[PDB]
Subunit: 385 residues, 2 copies
């Protein structure tokens, strides 16, 4: 309508200037004799979520304009849809809340409450806005999201729809948010509660491995449930392998990290095995994305050199840019592991992680941007008809 | 359209949060051993202009919705109109520039330029955005405004249209902006130009009197030109009297102020004469506004107790609220003069002036809100047909 567009404008404006204020306050008012990592490590989750919602708004716009309809694919209702302006405004609202909480963490405005209650309040509100039992604030769509989250987190007990698969895949890309939330739990359980601001931050007690692999587990058991429902082995078990490689990569990385902390002689072999398993996982997921989840590299593409037989997005350069971006964004782990194992600053692993997490969300953006199109065109996953 | 509404939202959001930041920086970072008056006295002009443009946007909305059409009255073009969202976004843009300049005056961001260049740059841009000789930034409407300003400031040489009269009246209400601009000229001509930040601020050399009465002069000579064009004495010379009273009030206030500064014995008589002349001016303009410029208090109003015979604005309470607001806003000078002449803080006259100038702009808001309606209904001024 019109009021929705005006609210998109209001929230986007407040957000851009809050970001300017936040950058300025971070460059200037950053004495911070204490360590600042227990703050950005807790706010990385909110940041990844807000960036993901912005990019999902852009995805919905691209779908609706290019021609690929997501009202039938997603099993939504042909009317009472959710345009992209709605996603933009709700992401902007969560961004306003994120920036306000972060500013309250920078300047301590109120002198009676400690500065550790602002992340707690921000995430408590982000949860209450989603479990809101009233008849307001996107009642229908938000409760559809709740039904979807309940049917995807209890995966091997329900029939696989396209929304289930799609949200399981999104959660498989946003693993840093789950790591963030479990880290916030661990911290607020294991930190002094007097005036300011370790066991976790490391893979010591294995909770990091479980939390990082739980979306891979979701998608793995989901595709196994689909293979039990139907009877076909090509796009089900070859798909389960892609998420078994994530299991193995996380396990070996955890063992290597704990052995490097303990300094045992079993560190180099586990490091090499982590290297080779992330290599096979990245090659696997790259081939899969370029072959099935996108349908590219078709056998009879005609004048289109490396594409399908037909296309929806007008500029053919978009697809080549997407191929390059998906082979660069994925495989960016090499820079990470090299710069962390070539004698850099002590606190640099988290620098690289925070730098490359929004880049991973961008990769998931592009992947959606093309997967919904391929699903509308070729019906890759046998979800309908 | 839609992009215009989104830009209204963007600018309104940036503006509200810039206002919050500005209020906070004014309450907290206000050491300011020096006097702060040469800053708010220079920014009051921009503030009154931005508030006036917001309220003119609201006026255009009220006109277009209530039914009173301003496309024929204002001699504009029935197509290529200017909706209220355009006024809102351009006022928001000037507000963004105002808030940015004021913040740059609070925090000195750049260390090489003195803090007196920001008001100069703000108003230089406000003038360049209006004299812009390109084919962009509201080319047609802005050059219509230039033609109107040139035909109204050279009043006694052109035929009086409704736009001429209306802008002369608006300028007759926004006299504080002209006082502000002449004061900025005087200051930047009579202030040290080394690192920071009197003859004016007072009515000493009479420039304040001339500047404060020049819109009254505009409207007076304009109604005299109209009386020469037509031949009718009721709504022309009785109208010229209303702006002759402003001449007399300003003259007597200037004489009283200069004699109080010089402490002569002629101060009390001039103060009493200023009192009585502002009394007669306020009663005159109140009776005129309630009788002719609004058409209220009709002789045959029917069931409507104190109104016209017909009305356009639905809630009848709006009109009574407007009568009360126009008899309160006008006549607010009594509080000013009493609190300034009953032994209050030295710097309090400018406090009261800055407090009551936006209130005067609000009075002009309501006056327009009803005058355009009465003009569409009864054709009070013989402007058409």
């Amino acid at each position: 309508p019109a009021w929705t567009t005006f609210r998109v404008g209001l929230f986007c404006g407040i957000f851009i200037v809050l970001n300017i204020t936040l950058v300025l306050a971070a460059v200037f008012k950053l004495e911070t004799d204490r360590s600042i990592w227990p703050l950005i490590r807790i706010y990385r989750g909110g940041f990844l979520l807000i960036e993901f919602l912005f990019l999902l708004g852009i995805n919905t716009y691209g779908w609706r304009q290019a021609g690929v309809n997501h009202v039938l694919i997603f099993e939504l209702n042909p009317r009472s849809n959710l345009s992209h302006q709605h996603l933009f405004e709700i992401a902007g609202f969560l961004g306003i809340l994120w920036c306000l909480s972060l500013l309250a963490c920078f300047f301590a405005p109120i002198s009676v409450i400690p500065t550790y209650v602002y992340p707690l309040a921000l995430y408590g509100f982000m949860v209450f806005f989603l479990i809101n039992p009233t008849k307001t604030f996107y009642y229908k769509s938000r409760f559809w999201l709740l039904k979807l989250l309940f049917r995807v987190f209890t995966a091997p007990f329900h029939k696989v729809g396209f929304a289930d698969f799609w949200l399981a895949d999104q959660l498989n890309s946003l693993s840093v948010i789950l790591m963030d939330l479990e880290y916030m739990i661990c911290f607020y359980s294991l930190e002094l509660k007097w005036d300011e601001s370790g066991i976790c931050h490391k893979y010591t007690y294995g909770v990091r491995a479980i939390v990082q692999c739980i979306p891979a587990w979701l998608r793995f058991i989901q595709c196994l449930r689909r293979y039990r429902d139907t009877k076909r082995a090509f796009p089900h078990l070859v798909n389960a392998g892609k998420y078994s490689t994530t299991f193995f990569m996380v396990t070996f990385a955890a063992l290597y990290s704990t052995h490097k902390e303990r300094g045992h002689s079993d560190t180099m072999v586990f490091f090499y095995l982590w290297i080779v398993f992330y290599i096979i996982s990245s090659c696997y997921t790259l081939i899969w994305d370029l072959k099935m989840d996108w349908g590219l590299f078709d056998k009879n593409a005609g004048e289109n050199t490396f594409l399908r037989e037909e296309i929806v997005y007008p500029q053919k350069a978009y697809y080549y840019c997407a191929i390059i971006e998906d082979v660069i964004l994925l495989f960016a782990w090499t820079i990470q592991i090299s710069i962390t194992s070539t004698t850099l600053l002590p606190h640099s692993g988290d620098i690289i992680a925070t730098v490359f997490a929004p880049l991973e969300v961008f990769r998931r953006f592009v992947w959606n941007f093309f997967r919904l199109e391929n699903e509308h065109l070729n019906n890759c996953g046998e979800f309908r008809a």
